Design a protein around this motif. Structure first.
Motif, mmCIF file in Angstrom:
data_model
loop_
_atom_site.group_PDB
_atom_site.id
_atom_site.type_symbol
_atom_site.label_atom_id
_atom_site.label_comp_id
_atom_site.label_asym_id
_atom_site.label_seq_id
_atom_site.Cartn_x
_atom_site.Cartn_y
_atom_site.Cartn_z
ATOM 1 N N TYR A 230 2.253 -2.770 1.076
ATOM 2 C CA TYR A 230 1.953 -1.524 0.387
ATOM 3 C C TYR A 230 2.717 -1.359 -0.916
ATOM 4 O O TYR A 230 2.389 -0.450 -1.687
ATOM 5 C CB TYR A 230 2.249 -0.330 1.295
ATOM 6 C CG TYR A 230 1.419 -0.290 2.553
ATOM 7 C CD1 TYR A 230 1.833 -0.953 3.696
ATOM 8 C CD2 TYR A 230 0.224 0.412 2.601
ATOM 9 C CE1 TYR A 230 1.084 -0.923 4.848
ATOM 10 C CE2 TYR A 230 -0.534 0.448 3.750
ATOM 11 C CZ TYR A 230 -0.098 -0.222 4.870
ATOM 12 O OH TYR A 230 -0.848 -0.191 6.021
ATOM 13 N N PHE A 231 3.721 -2.192 -1.175
ATOM 14 C CA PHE A 231 4.573 -1.996 -2.343
ATOM 15 C C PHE A 231 3.749 -2.042 -3.621
ATOM 16 O O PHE A 231 2.920 -2.936 -3.808
ATOM 17 C CB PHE A 231 5.672 -3.057 -2.385
ATOM 18 C CG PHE A 231 6.650 -2.959 -1.255
ATOM 19 C CD1 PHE A 231 6.673 -1.849 -0.430
ATOM 20 C CD2 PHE A 231 7.554 -3.978 -1.022
ATOM 21 C CE1 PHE A 231 7.569 -1.762 0.609
ATOM 22 C CE2 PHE A 231 8.456 -3.897 0.013
ATOM 23 C CZ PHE A 231 8.464 -2.787 0.831
ATOM 24 N N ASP A 232 3.976 -1.059 -4.494
ATOM 25 C CA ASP A 232 3.228 -0.906 -5.741
ATOM 26 C C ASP A 232 1.728 -0.837 -5.488
ATOM 27 O O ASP A 232 0.925 -1.275 -6.315
ATOM 28 C CB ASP A 232 3.558 -2.030 -6.727
ATOM 29 C CG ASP A 232 5.045 -2.147 -6.992
ATOM 30 O OD1 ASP A 232 5.730 -1.103 -7.005
ATOM 31 O OD2 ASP A 232 5.530 -3.282 -7.179
ATOM 32 N N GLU A 252 -12.198 12.917 7.612
ATOM 33 C CA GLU A 252 -11.454 11.711 7.283
ATOM 34 C C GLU A 252 -11.411 11.502 5.777
ATOM 35 O O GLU A 252 -12.364 11.821 5.060
ATOM 36 C CB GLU A 252 -12.071 10.480 7.951
ATOM 37 C CG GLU A 252 -11.991 10.492 9.464
ATOM 38 C CD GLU A 252 -13.037 11.381 10.099
ATOM 39 O OE1 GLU A 252 -14.242 11.128 9.892
ATOM 40 O OE2 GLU A 252 -12.653 12.337 10.803
ATOM 41 N N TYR A 253 -10.290 10.965 5.307
ATOM 42 C CA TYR A 253 -10.085 10.670 3.898
ATOM 43 C C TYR A 253 -10.252 9.180 3.649
ATOM 44 O O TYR A 253 -9.802 8.345 4.444
ATOM 45 C CB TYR A 253 -8.696 11.104 3.425
ATOM 46 C CG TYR A 253 -8.200 12.409 3.998
ATOM 47 C CD1 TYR A 253 -8.753 13.617 3.606
ATOM 48 C CD2 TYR A 253 -7.162 12.433 4.916
ATOM 49 C CE1 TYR A 253 -8.297 14.808 4.125
ATOM 50 C CE2 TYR A 253 -6.699 13.618 5.437
ATOM 51 C CZ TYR A 253 -7.270 14.803 5.041
ATOM 52 O OH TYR A 253 -6.809 15.988 5.562
ATOM 53 N N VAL A 254 -10.902 8.860 2.537
ATOM 54 C CA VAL A 254 -11.007 7.505 2.019
ATOM 55 C C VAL A 254 -10.132 7.439 0.778
ATOM 56 O O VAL A 254 -10.349 8.191 -0.180
ATOM 57 C CB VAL A 254 -12.460 7.135 1.699
ATOM 58 C CG1 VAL A 254 -12.517 5.956 0.748
ATOM 59 C CG2 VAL A 254 -13.220 6.839 2.980
ATOM 60 N N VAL A 255 -9.139 6.554 0.793
ATOM 61 C CA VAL A 255 -8.124 6.489 -0.252
ATOM 62 C C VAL A 255 -8.061 5.069 -0.789
ATOM 63 O O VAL A 255 -8.017 4.108 -0.014
ATOM 64 C CB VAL A 255 -6.746 6.943 0.269
ATOM 65 C CG1 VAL A 255 -6.455 6.301 1.609
ATOM 66 C CG2 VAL A 255 -5.655 6.617 -0.739
ATOM 67 N N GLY A 256 -8.061 4.937 -2.114
ATOM 68 C CA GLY A 256 -8.006 3.640 -2.760
ATOM 69 C C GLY A 256 -6.581 3.253 -3.115
ATOM 70 O O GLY A 256 -5.798 4.080 -3.590
ATOM 71 N N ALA A 257 -6.257 1.991 -2.871
ATOM 72 C CA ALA A 257 -4.997 1.388 -3.264
ATOM 73 C C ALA A 257 -5.331 0.162 -4.104
ATOM 74 O O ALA A 257 -5.366 -0.962 -3.585
ATOM 75 C CB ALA A 257 -4.154 1.016 -2.046
ATOM 76 N N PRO A 258 -5.587 0.347 -5.400
ATOM 77 C CA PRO A 258 -6.150 -0.742 -6.208
ATOM 78 C C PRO A 258 -5.264 -1.963 -6.315
ATOM 79 O O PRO A 258 -5.775 -3.047 -6.624
ATOM 80 C CB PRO A 258 -6.355 -0.083 -7.579
ATOM 81 C CG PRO A 258 -5.395 1.033 -7.603
ATOM 82 C CD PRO A 258 -5.318 1.549 -6.202
ATOM 83 N N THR A 259 -3.961 -1.836 -6.086
ATOM 84 C CA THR A 259 -3.041 -2.963 -6.167
ATOM 85 C C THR A 259 -2.366 -3.225 -4.826
ATOM 86 O O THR A 259 -1.220 -3.672 -4.774
ATOM 87 C CB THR A 259 -1.997 -2.725 -7.256
ATOM 88 O OG1 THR A 259 -1.226 -1.568 -6.925
ATOM 89 C CG2 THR A 259 -2.677 -2.493 -8.590
ATOM 90 N N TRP A 260 -3.068 -2.945 -3.736
ATOM 91 C CA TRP A 260 -2.513 -3.167 -2.412
ATOM 92 C C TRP A 260 -2.379 -4.660 -2.135
ATOM 93 O O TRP A 260 -3.281 -5.444 -2.436
ATOM 94 C CB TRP A 260 -3.398 -2.511 -1.358
ATOM 95 C CG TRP A 260 -2.831 -2.563 0.007
ATOM 96 C CD1 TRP A 260 -1.895 -1.731 0.533
ATOM 97 C CD2 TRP A 260 -3.162 -3.500 1.036
ATOM 98 N NE1 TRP A 260 -1.617 -2.091 1.827
ATOM 99 C CE2 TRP A 260 -2.383 -3.174 2.161
ATOM 100 C CE3 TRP A 260 -4.043 -4.580 1.115
ATOM 101 C CZ2 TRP A 260 -2.455 -3.891 3.350
ATOM 102 C CZ3 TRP A 260 -4.112 -5.292 2.295
ATOM 103 C CH2 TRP A 260 -3.321 -4.945 3.397
#
Ligand SMILES: *[C@@H]1O[C@H](CO)[C@@H](O[C@@H]2O[C@H](CO)[C@@H](O[C@@H]3O[C@H](CO)[C@@H](O)[C@H](O)[C@@H]3O)[C@H](O)[C@H]2NC(C)=O)[C@H](O)[C@H]1NC(C)=O
Ligand SMILES: CC(=O)N[C@@H]1[C@@H](O)[C@H](O)[C@@H](CO)O[C@H]1O
Ligand SMILES: CC(=O)N[C@@H]1[C@@H](O)[C@H](O)[C@@H](CO)O[C@H]1O
Ligand SMILES: CC(=O)N[C@@H]1[C@@H](O)[C@H](O)[C@@H](CO)O[C@H]1O
Ligand SMILES: CC(=O)N[C@@H]1[C@@H](O)[C@H](O)[C@@H](CO)O[C@H]1O
Ligand SMILES: *[C@@H]1O[C@H](CO)[C@@H](O)[C@H](O)[C@H]1NC(C)=O
Ligand SMILES: [Ca+2]
Ligand SMILES: [Ca+2]
Ligand SMILES: [Ca+2]
Ligand SMILES: [Ca+2]
Ligand SMILES: [Ca+2]
Ligand SMILES: [Ca+2]
Ligand SMILES: [Mg+2]
Lengths: 602, 506, 56
Positions: A230-232, A252-260
């Motif tokens: 998950y870092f950065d 429910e939430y849909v959440v983006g982590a573009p640099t996961w």
């Protein structure tokens, strides 16, 4: 598909104000729709970039709009020992505007905040601040979940645990139906990212003008993670809400982590307690898989479907090994909710460095066929690179893999036409959802109105195969007898809000395979095998069918007695280009072929 | 026999040749039966119609400019040629394919430009202490592999903007490591320290004058530095005659494009040189990070090999970056960069150990197929890159172009080039779709009804207005019964009572 | 429910009445509709008891 590209509405902001960075539709109490447009670099009172939000009432010509007067002023409040300060300079008021019910949440993610205790401090970091407003009543409020009073050295002492100083909360704002505002803070928990969710009523009822650091009692925040992946991650760059676990009580939430996971990118679907229901990994590193996320039921099966965007996807062309175009993923939710797996559709852009997938806007049911349509915007796509929007219609399996319509930028280059998208709201109230595209480069917003969709139906009946010379009704203007029969074609035009001037054109081609002027089958009148005639259906629930008498040439005259007799019925709109723009869209089956043969001893 | 040219209709020089390259057009005004004009060359030559008046273009690929491959590039690097040939003129009729071959040789001692891009983050301070005397030892080791080495230097930390740079107290804006009681220098995006030069003493002197800065987040604004170093020829001083090396030294992750939105920066990075007279990146705070695609494009456009000299904690990540950018390789730098000299030497050796072809401004119609002939005579089809080469070795590539249809331009030029090198082959493809006799049209051919038919190519083009054999059918189709009917000697019933005898069909 | 009573269409017939004994909607192939009404007690060939049909 039916979005008018000729007549557009142009809403302008101040010069260089980034008017159009984000936008949403606000519904006035009377049902009158207005546009909320963020201009995150509008000049503040002290001639400085602070931000701003404009409330554009709907019109036809468009133009300048009034602005919601927020409080653009640095705040200083000494709570005993400490000294809390908020700096509203280049805060970006308008980077995320979302309207729910009668309230508008306009978030400045880059508003700075400091806590001066004696010599020490908590560092002047951007925590972000959403500004909630009720333009019909003036009720202003603010929400800054990530503000803290912990001194800087404390985080160093505890390995920066639960460090919410760089949240930039309001980077991506959504509001659930139950009135809960959810903010994605990509920089929270030391750039891991978090979600801050709180009821709007509680936000309005827990804000006091003058107090800078308070605590909403019912708010909930994400969990800091020690997992190296998950870092950065920038977990909260894009956030959306939908039903993905069954029970309709839970949202429910849909959440983006573009640099996961080292810029691989991911999208997480998780319930209100932030328990990760499912994770959708990226495909190509540095593609920003999670930059934009949308939730809509494209296939119409009653279950919400997911749309992810990777604007920096480098496709593997045959000639070009890796070309940056962009890519939108479509995931279809099946029964057995914890089984959403491999992508169901992979839309890809064409123009290089066009960032296809920077904005995925669910359009609703633009074509009104029972399936949901979306719009994917490439802000720098298009042959000239000035910006494009591609409309994708929904169908039973996924959705259309080709753009039904393509909208090009009416603004000069670099306008970022398509960066902000918003739709599924009938702005003019003509029964069809409209679309608002925000080009902040030109500081303008383009409003596209969906013109009505005329769904056509064709039924051309030829009774049976015929004999060359039955010696029935004579050849026209002669006592010479020939074989004659009837051609009847019924054309219907069903649609919502169709005008009263609809008049289609029926092209009736008699055995189009043969060259004209000497066809095997002609008409019993003018003998023209190809007759295009107007058929008016301006408000007729009954299809109109003008039967025609048709003549058949002599057995010796026509020598190809083995070729099929194929009649062509084509339906086309009249040349409306002579007047104003085409007022209707003739989507549907408008061209059919009917085949018969030559019978004998009949 | 079948002569698929004869079927499918006959129009002019364009159509018969467009049907198939094997097809030929016998424009000579011979007997119409003896000159069908839509058939193969072998069939047409038997039935005369060929007084050198036949039309049958032959695809050709002539070497316009060829020089022999050099063997030692010690002197006159401008006169060193690594790709034979250098320019060819190719000729293709529509839907025809033709192949040629190129020879690529990496010279023995080619000039080298090494530019050292250094991550001046605080954790890289110890590394700065193992680099002070890098110029002398690097020259000593490189002299065994070149004779025109030139070293430069640039430094990068991250964008000098709020989410990455401490902005409180104001003393931190001039010493971002004030709290740890040490002294650092203000945050800088990318600064060009030393221009590429042969004097390694200059490199050892500019180092020991550099100080590290301090950033907040682990990712570093590195790709911005790579983009600015690449696109600035005048400032960096790249030679367009040497092996361009760009050693990238870092220990953390990197800021890919679209991350600048975390700082309010949404304007996309454009491949422009913004390094001003002060040798500082002047658009670092007002321009997003470059994407991998744009960085790769600008690397290829300026012929730069990229070496990720990255520490062991990020190596895999950058390794996964290496397999997204042609002509890049990753080396395992140490915590204090105690072996970057060996890393640079071995990375240069490995880079010279591979040759990969690249096609530039190729027209979409042309389709290429590659057969790589490496050491010995083994030829591997499909792939356009063979590894395992050494310094001085020679490799060959058989390249087939395959045009579909016929572009209207009729002359387009594209480039075949080994990755990294400036030596390139310019292929000028000319599409020979039409012919001389087609250009020699005679619409007023008196022979064709006083000139209502274009005698272009023996046959007469008159259209539905005069679609008869002699351009006499005043009305389209056989309905008007064009003059001189199929009735032999005329005065005969429907082409000898054969009903619709359809010109020659009776 | 929405049938307009205050305005009606009135069609006349023969003074011998029976105009309206039976009727139907003649649906033209072109899509048009006209009302066909049988008057089964119109005049005959010579003032005879016959029928007869009108097309309105
Ligand atoms: C650099 O790229 C390589 C190649 O893709 C990465 O190695 C592979 O990474 C994938 C991630 O998509 C791994 O697949 C996943 O593994 C997890 C377990 O860690 C599993 O739960 C998932 O279902 C999925 O199978 C794959 O195992 C892994 N293989 C190897 C041999 O490493 C590598 O991680 C990348 N390094 C980076 C991004 O730093
Ligand atoms: C960079 C920019 O936005 N410049 C604008 C210019 O385009 C416009 O014509 C003028 C009129 O007020 O204002 C300023
Ligand atoms: C081959 C054929 O029948 N084509 C028809 C023709 O009417 C026209 O090209 C178009 C629009 O009317 O609809 C289709
Ligand atoms: C058919 C085959 O095996 N190879 C073809 C041939 O034209 C050549 O060897 C080379 C051209 O690039 O590759 C391709
Ligand atoms: C109810 C009835 O039959 N009324 C008739 C009327 O239609 C006719 O016009 C008139 C004179 O002929 O005699 C009476
Ligand atoms: C959803 O909530 C309603 C509340 O009226 C309840 O009756 C129903 O059982 C709930 N469904 C669940 C928990 O699946
Ligand atoms: Ca649920
Ligand atoms: Ca679904
Ligand atoms: Ca639909
Ligand atoms: Ca509408
Ligand atoms: Ca170190
Ligand atoms: Ca920075
Ligand atoms: Mg570092």
């Amino acid at each position: 598909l039916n979005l008018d590209p000729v007549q557009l509405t142009f809403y302008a902001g101040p010069n260089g104000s980034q008017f159009g960075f984000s936008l949403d539709f606000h519904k006035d109490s009377h049902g009158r729709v207005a546009i909320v447009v963020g201009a995150p670099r509008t000049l503040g009172p002290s001639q400085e970039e602070t931000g701003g939000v404009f409330l554009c009432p709907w019109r036809a010509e468009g133009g300048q709009c009034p602005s919601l007067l927020f409080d653009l002023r640095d705040e200083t409040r000494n709570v005993g020992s400490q000294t809390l300060q908020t700096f509203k300079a280049r805060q970006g008021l308008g980077a995320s505007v979302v309207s729910w019910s009668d309230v508008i949440v306009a978030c400045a993610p880059w508003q700075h905040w400091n806590v001066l205790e004696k010599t020490e401090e908590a560092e002047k970091t951007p925590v972000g601040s959403c500004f909630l407003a009720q333009p019909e009543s003036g009720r202003r409020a603010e929400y800054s979940p990530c503000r803290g009073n912990t001194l800087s050295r404390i985080y160093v002492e505890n390995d920066f645990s639960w460090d919410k100083r760089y949240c930039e909360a309001g980077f991506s704002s959504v509001v659930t139906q139950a009135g809960e505002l959810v903010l994605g803070a990509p920089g929270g928990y030391y750039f891991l990212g978090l979600l801050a969710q709180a009821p709007v009523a509680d936000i309005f009822s827990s804000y006091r003008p003058g107090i800078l650091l308070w605590h909403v009692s019912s708010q909930s925040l994400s969990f800091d993670s020690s997992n190296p992946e998950y870092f950065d991650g920038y977990w909260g760059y894009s956030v959306a809400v939908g039903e993905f676990d069954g029970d309709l009580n839970t949202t429910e939430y849909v959440v983006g982590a573009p640099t996961w996971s080292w810029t691989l990118g991911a999208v997480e679907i998780l319930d209100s307690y932030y328990q990760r229901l499912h994770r959708l990994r990226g495909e190509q590193m540095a593609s920003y898989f999670g930059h934009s996320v949308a939730v809509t039921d494209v296939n119409g099966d009653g279950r919400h479907d997911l749309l992810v965007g990777a604007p920096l996807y480098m496709e593997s062309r045959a000639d070009r090994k890796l070309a940056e175009v962009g890519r939108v993923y479509l995931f279809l939710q099946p029964r057995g909710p914890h089984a959403l797996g491999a992508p169901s559709l992979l839309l890809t852009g064409t123009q290089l460095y066009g960032r296809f997938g920077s904005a995925i806007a669910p359009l609703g049911d633009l074509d009104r066929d029972g399936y949901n349509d979306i719009a994917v915007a490439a802000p720098y796509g298009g042959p000239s690179g000035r910006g494009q929007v591609l409309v994708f219609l929904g169908q039973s399996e996924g959705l259309r893999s080709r753009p039904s319509q393509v909208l090009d930028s009416p603004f000069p280059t670099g306008s970022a036409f398509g960066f902000s998208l918003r739709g599924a709201v009938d702005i003019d109230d003509n029964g069809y959802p409209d679309l608002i595209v925000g080009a902040y480069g030109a500081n303008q917003v383009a409003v596209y109105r969906a013109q009505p969709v005329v769904k056509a139906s064709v039924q051309l009946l030829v009774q049976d195969s015929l004999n060359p010379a039955v010696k029935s009704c004579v050849l026209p203007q002669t006592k010479t007898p020939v074989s004659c029969f009837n051609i009847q074609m019924c054309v219907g035009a069903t649609g919502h809000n169709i005008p009263q001037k609809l008049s289609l054109n029926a092209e009736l081609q008699l055995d189009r395979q043969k060259p004209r002027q000497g066809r095997r089958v002609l008409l019993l009148g003018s003998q023209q095998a190809g007759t295009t005639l107007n058929l008016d259906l301006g408000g007729k629930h009954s299809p109109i069918c003008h039967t025609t008498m048709a003549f058949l040439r002599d057995e010796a005259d026509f020598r190809d007695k083995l070729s099929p007799i194929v009649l062509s019925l084509n339906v086309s709109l009249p040349p409306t280009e002579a007047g104003m723009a085409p007022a209707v869209v003739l989507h549907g089956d408008t061209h059919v072929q009917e085949q018969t043969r030559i019978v004998l001893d009949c | 026999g079948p002569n698929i040219c004869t079927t499918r209709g006959v129009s002019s020089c364009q159509q018969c040749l467009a049907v198939s390259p094997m097809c030929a057009w016998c424009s000579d005004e011979a007997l119409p039966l003896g000159s069908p004009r839509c058939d193969l060359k072998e069939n047409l030559l038997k039935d005369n119609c060929a007084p050198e008046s036949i039309e049958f273009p032959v695809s050709e690929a002539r070497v316009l400019e060829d020089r022999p491959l050099s063997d030692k590039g010690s002197g006159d690097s401008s006169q060193v040629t690594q790709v034979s040939p250098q320019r060819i003129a190719l000729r293709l009729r529509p839907d025809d394919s033709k192949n040629f071959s190129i020879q690529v040789r990496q010279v023995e001692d080619y000039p080298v430009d090494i530019y050292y891009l250094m991550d001046l983050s605080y954790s890289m301070k110890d590394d700065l202490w193992s680099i002070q005397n890098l110029g002398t030892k690097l020259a000593t080791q490189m002299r065994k592999l070149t004779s025109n080495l030139r070293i430069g230097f640039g430094a990068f930390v991250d964008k000098p903007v709020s989410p990455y740079m401490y902005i409180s107290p104001p003393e931190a804006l001039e010493n971002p490591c004030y709290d740890m009681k040490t002294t650092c220098l203000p945050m800088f995006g990318y600064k060009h320290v030393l221009t590429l030069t042969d004097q390694v003493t200059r490199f050892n002197e500019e180092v020991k004058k550099q100080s590290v800065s301090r950033n907040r987040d682990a990712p570093e604004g590195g790709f911005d530095a790579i983009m600015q170093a690449t696109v600035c020829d005048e400032k960096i001083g790249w030679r367009n005659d040497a092996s361009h090396l760009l050693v990238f030294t870092t220990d953390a992750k990197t800021h890919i494009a679209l991350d600048g939105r975390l700082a309010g920066i949404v304007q996309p990075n454009d491949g422009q040189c913004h390094v001003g007279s002060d040798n500082h990146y002047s658009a670092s705070t007002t321009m997003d990070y470059p994407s991998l695609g744009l960085m790769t494009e600008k690397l290829s456009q300026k012929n730069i090999n990229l070496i990720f000299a990255v520490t062991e904690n990020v190596v895999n990540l950058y390794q996964n970056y290496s397999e997204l950018i042609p002509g890049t390789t990753v080396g395992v730098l140490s915590m204090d960069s105690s072996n970057v000299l060996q890393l640079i030497v071995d990375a240069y050796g490995k880079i010279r150990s591979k040759v990969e072809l690249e096609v530039r401004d190729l027209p979409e119609e042309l389709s290429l197929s590659f057969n790589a002939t490496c050491l010995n005579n083994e030829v591997i089809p499909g792939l356009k890159s063979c590894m395992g080469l050494k310094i001085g070795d020679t490799v060959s590539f058989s390249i087939e172009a395959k045009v579909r249809g016929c572009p209207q331009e009729k002359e387009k030029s594209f480039t075949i080039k080994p990755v990294g090198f400036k030596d390139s082959l310019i292929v000028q493809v000319t599409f020979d779709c039409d012919c001389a006799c087609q250009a020699q049209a005679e619409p007023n051919s008196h022979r064709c009804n006083n000139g209502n038919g274009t005698f272009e190519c023996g046959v007469c083009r008159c259209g539905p207005g005069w679609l008869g054999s002699q351009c006499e059918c005043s009305e389209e189709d056989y309905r008007p019964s064009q003059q001189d009917e199929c009735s032999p000697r005329e005065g005969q019933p429907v082409c000898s009572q054969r009903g619709e005898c359809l010109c020659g069909q009776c």
